[PDB]
Amino acid sequence: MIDKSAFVHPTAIVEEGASIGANAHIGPFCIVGPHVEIGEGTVLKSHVVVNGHTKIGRDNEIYQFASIGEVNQDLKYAGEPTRVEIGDRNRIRESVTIHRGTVQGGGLTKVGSDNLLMINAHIAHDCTVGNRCILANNATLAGHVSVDDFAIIGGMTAVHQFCIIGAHVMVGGCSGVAQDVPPYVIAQGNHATPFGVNIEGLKRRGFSREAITAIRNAYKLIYRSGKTLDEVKPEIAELAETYPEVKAFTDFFARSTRGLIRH
Amino acid sequence: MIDKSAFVHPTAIVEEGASIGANAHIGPFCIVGPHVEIGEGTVLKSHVVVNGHTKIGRDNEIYQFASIGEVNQDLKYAGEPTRVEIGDRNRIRESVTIHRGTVQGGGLTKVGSDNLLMINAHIAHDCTVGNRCILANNATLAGHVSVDDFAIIGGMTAVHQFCIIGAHVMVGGCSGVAQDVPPYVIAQGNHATPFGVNIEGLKRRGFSREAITAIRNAYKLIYRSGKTLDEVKPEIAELAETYPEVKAFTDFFARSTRGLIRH
Amino acid sequence: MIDKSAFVHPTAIVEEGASIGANAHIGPFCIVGPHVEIGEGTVLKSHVVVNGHTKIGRDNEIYQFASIGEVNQDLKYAGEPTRVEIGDRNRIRESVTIHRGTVQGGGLTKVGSDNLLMINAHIAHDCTVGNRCILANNATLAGHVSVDDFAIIGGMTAVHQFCIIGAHVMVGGCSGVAQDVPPYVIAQGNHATPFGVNIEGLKRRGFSREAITAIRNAYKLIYRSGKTLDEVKPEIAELAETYPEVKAFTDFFARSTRGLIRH
Ligand SMILES: CCCCCCCCCCC[C@@H](O)CC(=O)O[C@H]1[C@H](O)[C@@H](CO)O[C@H](OP(=O)(O)OP(=O)(O)OC[C@H]2O[C@@H](n3ccc(=O)[nH]c3=O)[C@H](O)[C@@H]2O)[C@@H]1NC(C)=O
Ligand SMILES: CCCCCCCCCCC[C@@H](O)CC(=O)O[C@H]1[C@H](O)[C@@H](CO)O[C@H](OP(=O)(O)OP(=O)(O)OC[C@H]2O[C@@H](n3ccc(=O)[nH]c3=O)[C@H](O)[C@@H]2O)[C@@H]1NC(C)=O
Ligand SMILES: CCCCCCCCCCC[C@@H](O)CC(=O)O[C@H]1[C@H](O)[C@@H](CO)O[C@H](OP(=O)(O)OP(=O)(O)OC[C@H]2O[C@@H](n3ccc(=O)[nH]c3=O)[C@H](O)[C@@H]2O)[C@@H]1NC(C)=O
Ligand SMILES: Cc1ccnc(-c2cc(C(=O)N3CCOC[C@H]3Cc3ccccc3F)[nH]n2)c1
Ligand SMILES: Cc1ccnc(-c2cc(C(=O)N3CCOC[C@H]3Cc3ccccc3F)[nH]n2)c1
Ligand SMILES: Cc1ccnc(-c2cc(C(=O)N3CCOC[C@H]3Cc3ccccc3F)[nH]n2)c1
Known part of the structure; x- marks a missing residue:
C-alpha cells in the first residue's frame, strides 16, 4: 500500500x-x-x-x-x-x-x-x-x-x-x-x-575519564601483559565489576570466532 | 533482430x-x-x-x-x-x-x-x-x-x-x-x-594427488631451487613429460612478458 | 535556458x-x-x-x-x-x-x-x-x-x-x-x-635538461641533504633564481599544511 x-x-x-x-x-x-x-x-x-x-x-x-x-x-x-x-x-x-x-x-x-x-x-x-x-x-x-x-x-x-x-x-x-x-x-x-584505544572517539561520546582509563587498562591486559586471552578474560571481567563499559570486551569475546587482530 | x-x-x-x-x-x-x-x-x-x-x-x-x-x-x-x-x-x-x-x-x-x-x-x-x-x-x-x-x-x-x-x-x-x-x-x-601452490583449489577441482605433487615440485623448481628461470624451464618441461598438468607452466612462460612475481 | x-x-x-x-x-x-x-x-x-x-x-x-x-x-x-x-x-x-x-x-x-x-x-x-x-x-x-x-x-x-x-x-x-x-x-x-623525480613525465612535457637537473637538485636538498625544511627553503629559492621551474617548490611550501611525505 x-x-x-x-x-x-x-x-x-x-x-x-x-x-x-x-x-x-x-x-x-x-x-x-x-x-x-x-x-x-x-x-x-x-x-x-x-x-x-x-x-x-x-x-x-x-x-x-x-x-x-x-x-x-x-x-x-x-x-x-x-x-x-x-x-x-x-x-x-x-x-x-x-x-x-x-x-x-x-x-x-x-x-x-x-x-x-x-x-x-x-x-x-x-x-x-x-x-x-x-x-x-x-x-x-x-x-x-x-x-x-x-x-x-x-x-x-x-x-x-x-x-x-x-x-x-x-x-x-x-x-x-x-x-x-x-x-x-x-x-x-x-x-x-x-x-x-580510540580515546578521542570515546571522549566525544561522553565516556568518563574513569571509563576510558579502565578501557585502556583492559587493552593493556589483552595486548601488553603478555598473558593469553584465556588468562585475561577473568581479569577483564573483574575490572568490569567496577567499570561497566569494560563488559563490552566480555560480550565481544563471546561472539569472536576468528581470534583478535594482533601486532 | x-x-x-x-x-x-x-x-x-x-x-x-x-x-x-x-x-x-x-x-x-x-x-x-x-x-x-x-x-x-x-x-x-x-x-x-x-x-x-x-x-x-x-x-x-x-x-x-x-x-x-x-x-x-x-x-x-x-x-x-x-x-x-x-x-x-x-x-x-x-x-x-x-x-x-x-x-x-x-x-x-x-x-x-x-x-x-x-x-x-x-x-x-x-x-x-x-x-x-x-x-x-x-x-x-x-x-x-x-x-x-x-x-x-x-x-x-x-x-x-x-x-x-x-x-x-x-x-x-x-x-x-x-x-x-x-x-x-x-x-x-x-x-x-x-x-x-593453491592446493585446496586444485583438490576441489579434481586434480589428482600425483598432479598436485608434481605442481608443487615445479613450484619449488621456480622459487626454491635457487636456479634461474632459464635453467628451470627444461626441468619443468621434463616433469611435464610425466604429469601433463605441469605443461601449464610451459605454456605460461611462453606468454609471460613482465617476469614472475617473486619473494 | x-x-x-x-x-x-x-x-x-x-x-x-x-x-x-x-x-x-x-x-x-x-x-x-x-x-x-x-x-x-x-x-x-x-x-x-x-x-x-x-x-x-x-x-x-x-x-x-x-x-x-x-x-x-x-x-x-x-x-x-x-x-x-x-x-x-x-x-x-x-x-x-x-x-x-x-x-x-x-x-x-x-x-x-x-x-x-x-x-x-x-x-x-x-x-x-x-x-x-x-x-x-x-x-x-x-x-x-x-x-x-x-x-x-x-x-x-x-x-x-x-x-x-x-x-x-x-x-x-x-x-x-x-x-x-x-x-x-x-x-x-x-x-x-x-x-x-618524475623525470619521464617532465621529459614528455617539454621540460629542458637543465630544468630537470635543477628539479632533481631541489629534490636532493629536500630529501638527501639531511637539512631541515626551514634550512632548504632559501636554498631552493636561490636555485629558482636561475631555474624558474624550481619556484614550484616555493609556491607549494607556502600552501603545504600537513608536512611532506618522507622516507
Ligand atoms: C591512508 C589515507 C587514507 C585516506 C582515505 C580517504 C577516504 C575519503 C573518502 C571520501 C570522504 C569525503 O567525501 C568526505 C570527507 O572527507 O569528509 C570529512 C571532511 O573532509 C573532514 C574535514 O573537513 O571532516 C570530517 O572528517 P574528520 O575525521 O575530521 O571528522 P570528525 O572529526 O567529525 O570525525 C568523524 C567521526 O570520527 C570519529 N572519530 C574521530 C577521531 C578519532 O580519533 N576517533 C573517532 O572515532 C568521530 O567520533 C566522528 O564520529 C569529514 N568526515 C565526516 C565523516 O564527516
Ligand atoms: C585482507 C582482507 C581482504 C577481504 C576482502 C573481502 C572482499 C569481499 C567482497 C564482497 C563479497 C561478498 O558480497 C560475498 C561473499 O563474501 O561471499 C562469500 C561468503 O561470505 C563465504 C562465507 O559464507 O563463502 C564464500 O567464500 P569462501 O571463500 O568461503 O568460498 P568457497 O570456499 O566456495 O571458495 C570460493 C572459490 O575459491 C576457491 N578456493 C577456495 C579456497 C582455496 O584455498 N583456494 C581456492 O581456489 C574455490 O575453488 C572457489 O572457486 C563466498 N564467496 C563466494 C565467491 O561464493
Ligand atoms: C600496484 C599495481 C596497481 C595497478 C593499478 C591499475 C589500475 C588500472 C585502472 C584501469 C585503467 C584501464 O581501464 C585503462 C588503462 O590501463 O590504460 C593504459 C593502457 O593499458 C596502457 C597500455 O596500453 O597505456 C596507458 O598507460 P601508460 O602508463 O603506458 O600510459 P602513458 O605512457 O601514455 O602515460 C600516461 C600518463 O602518465 C604520465 N607519465 C608516464 C610515465 C612516467 O614515468 N611519468 C608520468 O608522469 C604521462 O605523462 C601520461 O600523462 C593507458 N593509460 C592511459 C591513462 O592512457
Ligand atoms: C593517517 C591515516 C591512516 C589511516 N586512515 C586514514 C584515513 C581514513 C580516512 C577516512 O576514510 N575518512 C572518511 C572521510 O572522513 C574523513 C575520514 C574519517 C575516518 C577516519 C578513519 C576511519 C573511518 C573514517 F570515516 N581518512 N584518513 C588516515
Ligand atoms: C587473509 C586474507 C588475505 C588476503 N585476502 C583475503 C580475502 C580475499 C577475499 C575475497 O575477496 N573473497 C571474495 C568473497 O568471497 C570470499 C573471498 C573469496 C576469495 C578469496 C581470495 C581471492 C578471491 C576470492 F574471491 N576474502 N578474504 C584474506
Ligand atoms: C609497479 C607499480 C607501482 C604502483 N602503481 C603502479 C600502477 C598504477 C597504475 C595506474 O593506475 N594506471 C592507470 C591506467 O593507466 C595505466 C596507469 C597509469 C598511471 C600510473 C601511475 C599513476 C597514475 C596513472 F594513471 N598502473 N600501474 C605500478
Whole structure:
C-alpha cells in the first residue's frame, strides 16, 4: 500500500504489493519490488533499485545508483527468499550495495539507524551493522561481518568474512581486516593490527575519564601483559565489576570466532 | 533482430540493429546499442548500458549500473570500432565495467563463460578473462591483462597492465599485482608475492594427488631451487613429460612478458 | 535556458532554470537540476545526475552513473547552497562522483580542464583539481585535497583530507597518501613515500635538461641533504633564481599544511 502522502515519481516503477509510508519520496527511475517496505519520510533520490524482502525504516536518504535488497554474491545462494532490514535516519550514498542474506547464514542482512554509508560501500549477505557507524568510500564487508555500534571503517578498507568490528572501533583507510577487532580499538594496516584505544572517539561520546582509563587498562591486559586471552578474560571481567563499559570486551569475546587482530 | 520471445521493457531503449535472442530479458531503463548481440536467456536486470561492437552469450545475468562495451580509458584510443566478446552463464554484478579493445592492443576485450564479476570489477580494454574466474568487489584490471581459467582475484586488488594471472591462481584481497603470476600459485601483497601452490583449489577441482605433487615440485623448481628461470624451464618441461598438468607452466612462460612475481 | 541546438533526450529531466549550451547533448534518463549550467558541446551520455549550483564547461564527456554537484559526505554540511565548477574537455567516466563544497571549507569544489577521471574516482567537497590530471579507477580524495596541474593518481589510491598532490606528481596505485607531495615527485606506498623525480613525465612535457637537473637538485636538498625544511627553503629559492621551474617548490611550501611525505 502506497500512502496517500507519499510521492512516487511517474517514471519510477513501484510494483504492486510494495508498502510506501507517509511523506516518503520515490524519485525518477527508481525500481521498488513487491516485497519492499519503505518507512515514513524516507527518500530514494533517483535511479535506486530496492528489491527482495526488504524493510527500510523512516527518514532514510538513499542516493542514486544504490542497490538495496539485491541477490547476494555468495555462490552458495540459490534464490531463497531471504531478507534485509534497514533502520532509521541512515544516509546511504551513491552506488552503495546492501545484499540480502543466505539461508546458511541466518537469512538476514541488518543495518541499524543513524549510519553513514559512503559511496560504493558494500554490505554483504548476513552482515549486521549497528547504529551510528560510518563506512567510508569503497569500504567493503565480506559476508557475515558484524560492524558494532559507533564503529567507523576508513576508505578503501575491506573486511574478511565473519570478522567482528567491535563497538567504537576506528579502522584506518587502505586497510585489510582479517581477524576480529575488540571494542574501543584503533586498527590499521594490511593486515590490520591494533594501535591503542580510540580515546578521542570515546571522549566525544561522553565516556568518563574513569571509563576510558579502565578501557585502556583492559587493552593493556589483552595486548601488553603478555598473558593469553584465556588468562585475561577473568581479569577483564573483574575490572568490569567496577567499570561497566569494560563488559563490552566480555560480550565481544563471546561472539569472536576468528581470534583478535594482533601486532 | 529482436526474437519474438525476448522481453524488452517499454522504458528500455534498444537501437535498431541490435540482436536480442530467444527468452532474453531487457529490463527497465537499459540502453542497448545497434551493434550489440545478446544471446538466448541473457538478462539485463535494469539500468544497464551495453554499446559498441559487443557480443554477449547465453544465460548471462547482468546487474544494474553495469557498463558493457563502453569506450575504454586508454588515452591512445580514438574511437575506432573495436570489440567486446562475453561468453555464457556469467554473473556480472552491479557497476561492473567491461571496456572495448584498442586497435593497438588487438581490438578485442574477451570474457569467457561461468565467471563471477563482483560489484565494480573492471575489465579494461584488450583484457582476456577465461572461464570460471572470480573477480571480487573492486578488483581492477589495467589494459591487456590476462586472467586465465579458474583464477580468482580478491577484493580491492588491482593488476598492472599486460600482467598474466595464471590458471587456478588465487590472488588475495588488498593486493597489487605488478608482474606475472604462474599457474596454480597463491599470491598476496603490495606488490604481490608468491605464497605456495593453491592446493585446496586444485583438490576441489579434481586434480589428482600425483598432479598436485608434481605442481608443487615445479613450484619449488621456480622459487626454491635457487636456479634461474632459464635453467628451470627444461626441468619443468621434463616433469611435464610425466604429469601433463605441469605443461601449464610451459605454456605460461611462453606468454609471460613482465617476469614472475617473486619473494 | 536550453539552447535551440542542444539535444535533450525525451526521457531526460532538465529542470526549469538549467542552462544548456549550444550543441550539448543530454542523454536518456539524465537528471539536471535548476542551478546547473552545461557548456557548449558537453555530452552527458545517459543515467547522469547533475544538481546543485554547478557550472560545467565545454566539450566535456560525462559517462553513465556519474553524480556531479551532489551533496557532499561531510557530516558538518547542512544543506547550504555551495558550488561545483568544472572546466573544459574533461573525460568523466562511469560512476565518478564530484561533490559540492562546504561553507566551512570555502564553498567550492573545483575541477579544471583536460582531466581524465576514471571509473568511480571521487572528488570530495572543497577539493581543487587542476588541469591535465589523471585519477585512475577508484582514486579517492577526501575533502579539501588539492591535485595540482598534470598530477596523476594511480588506481585504488586514496588521499587524506587537506593533502596537496603537487604539480607533475605521480602517485602509484594501491597507495595511501597522508601528507603533502611536493611538485615533480613520484610517490608510492601505504603510507606513500617519495621515490625520486618524475623525470619521464617532465621529459614528455617539454621540460629542458637543465630544468630537470635543477628539479632533481631541489629534490636532493629536500630529501638527501639531511637539512631541515626551514634550512632548504632559501636554498631552493636561490636555485629558482636561475631555474624558474624550481619556484614550484616555493609556491607549494607556502600552501603545504600537513608536512611532506618522507622516507
Ligand atoms: C585482507 C582482507 C581482504 C577481504 C576482502 C573481502 C572482499 C569481499 C567482497 C564482497 C563479497 C561478498 O558480497 C560475498 C561473499 O563474501 O561471499 C562469500 C561468503 O561470505 C563465504 C562465507 O559464507 O563463502 C564464500 O567464500 P569462501 O571463500 O568461503 O568460498 P568457497 O570456499 O566456495 O571458495 C570460493 C572459490 O575459491 C576457491 N578456493 C577456495 C579456497 C582455496 O584455498 N583456494 C581456492 O581456489 C574455490 O575453488 C572457489 O572457486 C563466498 N564467496 C563466494 C565467491 O561464493
Ligand atoms: C600496484 C599495481 C596497481 C595497478 C593499478 C591499475 C589500475 C588500472 C585502472 C584501469 C585503467 C584501464 O581501464 C585503462 C588503462 O590501463 O590504460 C593504459 C593502457 O593499458 C596502457 C597500455 O596500453 O597505456 C596507458 O598507460 P601508460 O602508463 O603506458 O600510459 P602513458 O605512457 O601514455 O602515460 C600516461 C600518463 O602518465 C604520465 N607519465 C608516464 C610515465 C612516467 O614515468 N611519468 C608520468 O608522469 C604521462 O605523462 C601520461 O600523462 C593507458 N593509460 C592511459 C591513462 O592512457
Ligand atoms: C591512508 C589515507 C587514507 C585516506 C582515505 C580517504 C577516504 C575519503 C573518502 C571520501 C570522504 C569525503 O567525501 C568526505 C570527507 O572527507 O569528509 C570529512 C571532511 O573532509 C573532514 C574535514 O573537513 O571532516 C570530517 O572528517 P574528520 O575525521 O575530521 O571528522 P570528525 O572529526 O567529525 O570525525 C568523524 C567521526 O570520527 C570519529 N572519530 C574521530 C577521531 C578519532 O580519533 N576517533 C573517532 O572515532 C568521530 O567520533 C566522528 O564520529 C569529514 N568526515 C565526516 C565523516 O564527516
Ligand atoms: C593517517 C591515516 C591512516 C589511516 N586512515 C586514514 C584515513 C581514513 C580516512 C577516512 O576514510 N575518512 C572518511 C572521510 O572522513 C574523513 C575520514 C574519517 C575516518 C577516519 C578513519 C576511519 C573511518 C573514517 F570515516 N581518512 N584518513 C588516515
Ligand atoms: C587473509 C586474507 C588475505 C588476503 N585476502 C583475503 C580475502 C580475499 C577475499 C575475497 O575477496 N573473497 C571474495 C568473497 O568471497 C570470499 C573471498 C573469496 C576469495 C578469496 C581470495 C581471492 C578471491 C576470492 F574471491 N576474502 N578474504 C584474506
Ligand atoms: C609497479 C607499480 C607501482 C604502483 N602503481 C603502479 C600502477 C598504477 C597504475 C595506474 O593506475 N594506471 C592507470 C591506467 O593507466 C595505466 C596507469 C597509469 C598511471 C600510473 C601511475 C599513476 C597514475 C596513472 F594513471 N598502473 N600501474 C605500478
